[PDB]
């Protein structure tokens, strides 16, 4: 049932309390109503995969395409509007090789140490 599933949906993002469950259910229904009042997936997916390829994630572009193909040869065992599910994921989407990868790892840890310090600096 759709009315239940929308409450499971709001409640899943939190995993007073009782009031809040209703406040957030009301929002789900509302957005649905507003939305109503106002290309095939397969292609949309390829276009996301193009964007990966130019960024040098060749392996991942293959892998996203391979898996999207796999589902289509089966019919799902608990899926039945597979195009729409993939579509929802689409709309919510978003030497020197080894020094690029390492350099990112080191630079990301460098960012973290500084954000904890500035935050403590802020309380004072």
């Amino acid at each position: 049932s759709i009315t239940k599933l929308f409450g499971d949906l709001c409640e899943s993002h939190m995993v007073s309390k009782n009031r809040t469950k209703q406040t957030l259910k009301k929002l789900a229904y509302d957005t649905l109503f507003v939305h109503l009042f106002q290309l095939p997936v397969k292609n949309k997916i390829i276009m996301l995969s193009f964007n990966l390829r130019i960024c040098g994630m060749s392996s991942e572009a293959d892998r996203l395409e391979e898996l999207v193909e796999y589902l289509e040869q089966s019919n799902g065992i608990q899926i039945s509007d597979l195009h729409a599910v993939l579509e929802l994921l689409v709309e919510l989407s978003g030497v020197q090789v080894f020094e690029a990868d390492l350099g990112t790892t080191v630079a990301y840890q460098e960012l973290e140490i500084s954000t904890t310090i500035q935050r403590t600096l802020q309380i004072m």
Partner: protein, 254 residues
């Protein structure tokens, strides 16, 4: 001022600093040998090895750790988990160092509170290494489960992490032994000793005798004895692991 902050940071980072800790041979606080002496000295000294005892105890365990395995596989697996929570401990020291040199903040009260959340963390991890002299799981497994049985969600988080990694040889030994009866222990990573009673042409007799002496808390005596029966027939969650072994008892039966 700032020199005596530097001096206490090194005790967290390792063992001793600019002056050595030991009157005799023991790790109780440090010598009065500071450049500034007040009567606030008596508390900067008692806030310099408050957790310093408890850093070097885990670090020294990890120093002794270097077996390719011998007298328990599980013992050193436990000690790896402690090397990972050591690791995180070092990142909270690197932000102190980062405020105490050029790349107040030279105050020694700010860092107190920032080690005070770690003072409930690394202190009960020192309590847990003194509670585990086990080396075949079910003393270690019975240890980390017994600190989720007392309150405080700041030590409940630390010991619920470890439970899943003391467990990691115990279930990796299990699944293979439901299915095939594969064996890949020489030091015993399970709570059932592997062939104590040599294989002979069977009546369907015990080729394994169980130790009731060490048992996980994610198993029991009667659940230990069930899975030995799955091993004959082929020939995190703390009560839901005992359910699914009974569905392995049920799957080899049907």
């Amino acid at each position: 001022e700032t020199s005596l902050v530097r001096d206490l940071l090194y005790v967290f980072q390792g063992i001793d600093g600019k002056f050595v800790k030991m009157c005799n041979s023991e790790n109780c606080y440090k010598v009065d040998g500071k450049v500034a002496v007040s009567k606030s000295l008596k508390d900067i000294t008692s806030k310099l090895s408050e957790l310093g005892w408890l850093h070097n105890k885990i670090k020294k365990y990890t120093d002794q750790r270097s077996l390719d395995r011998a007298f328990g596989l599980v013992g050193q697996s436990f000690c790896a988990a402690l090397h990972q929570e050591l690791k995180e401990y070092y990142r909270l020291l690197s932000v102190l160092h980062s405020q105490l040199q050029v790349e107040s903040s030279l105050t020694l009260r700010r860092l107190l509170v920032w080690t005070f959340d770690p003072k409930i963390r690394l202190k009960t991890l020192a309590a847990l290494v003194d509670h585990c002299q086990g080396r075949k799981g079910g003393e270690l497994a019975s240890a980390v489960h017994a600190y989720t049985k007392t309150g405080d969600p700041y030590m409940r988080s630390l010991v619920q992490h470890i439970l899943g990694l003391v467990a990691y040889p115990i279930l990796n030994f299990l699944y293979r032994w439901i299915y095939d009866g594969e064996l890949e222990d020489t030091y015993h990573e399970f709570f059932v000793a592997s062939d104590p009673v040599v294989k002979t042409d069977r009546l369907w007799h015990d080729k394994y005798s169980l130790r009731k002496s060490m048992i996980p808390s994610f198993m029991t005596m009667d659940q230990s004895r069930k899975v030995l029966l799955i091993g004959k027939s082929i020939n995190d969650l703390e009560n839901a692991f005992q359910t699914k072994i009974d569905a392995a008892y049920f799957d080899t039966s049907k």
